[PDB]
RNA sequence: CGAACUUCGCG
RNA sequence: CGAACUUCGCG
């Protein structure tokens, strides 16, 4: 049901002002698809986060956990872009 | 985490 | 929408 990859967003790997979430939003626009929908969840252990992104009725999620909601969403966008072999920026 | 606040970038 | 920046409140 969900496509997963072991990915973590590291801002240092991307030029300033460029993000996987932005790239995905732009790709959906060009492909005339909806708009990504993110469902984010919290861990009571280390106060860790994960996110499931829905694009073209398919769900994507990293196998890894992140320090914040925003970082988890970026990881989910990476899974979506990368699993499709899409640019994702840098 | 959320909200407010300026700056920046794409629609 | 998204990024950086401070502030507030709660957590």
Residue numbers in the entry: 351 to 440
Question: What did the article's authors report about this structure?
Answer:
However, this belief has recently been challenged by the discovery of a dsRBD serving as a major tRNA binding module for human dihydrouridine synthase 2 (hDus2), a flavoenzyme that catalyzes synthesis of dihydrouridine within the complex elbow structure of tRNA. Dus2 is found in all eukaryotes and catalyzes formation of dihydrouridine 20 in tRNA. However, in stark contrast, we showed that, despite the presence of a HD domain, hDus2 and by inference from the sequences probably all animal ones instead use a novel extended dsRBD version flanked by a peculiar N-terminal extension (NTE) and C-terminal extension (CTE) to provide the major binding sites for tRNA substrate. By solving the crystal structure of this dsRBD in complex with a dsRNA together with extensive characterizations of its interaction with tRNA using mutagenesis, NMR and SAXS, we establish that while hDus2 dsRBD retains a conventional dsRNA recognition capability, the presence of an N-terminal extension appended to the canonical domain provides additional residues for binding tRNA in a structure-specific mode of action.
To investigate how this novel extended dsRBD recognizes a dsRNA molecule, we crystallized hDus2′s dsRBD (construct T339-K451 of human Dus2) in complex with an eleven palindromic oligo-ribonucleotide and solved the whole structure. The designed dsRNA, which harbors two overhangs at the 3′-extremities, self-assembles into a pseudo A-helix. Overall, there are no major structural changes detected between free and bound dsRBD, except for a notable modification in the twist of the C-terminal region of strand β1 induced by dsRNA that consequently alters loop β1–β2 conformation. Recognition of dsRNA is essentially achieved via three major canonical regions namely helix-α1, helix-α2 and the C-terminal part of the β1–β2 loop. Three residues of helix-α1 (T369, E376, R379) interact with ribose 2′-OH groups in dsRNA’s minor groove while K371 of helix-α1 together with K419, K420 and Q424 located in the N-terminal extremity of helix α2 recognize exclusively the phosphodiester backbone of the major groove. Remarkably, the C-terminal part of the β1–β2 loop binds to the mG+1 minor groove via R397, which makes hydrogen bonds with both the ribose and nucleobase C10. Note that animal Dus2 dsRBDs have a shorter β1–β2 loop, with 2–3 residues less than the one of archetypal dsRBDs, preventing the canonical mode of RNA recognition via this loop, and likely explaining the peculiar contacts observed for this region in the dsRBD-RNA structure (see also the discussion). Although the majority of dsRNA recognition is ensured by interactions involving the canonical fold, our structure reveals that there is a residue Q367 located in the NTE, more precisely between the 310 helix and the beginning of helix-α1 that also participates to dsRNA recognition. Q367 interacts with C8, A’3 and G’2 in proximity to helix-α1 binding site further extending the interaction surface with the minor groove.
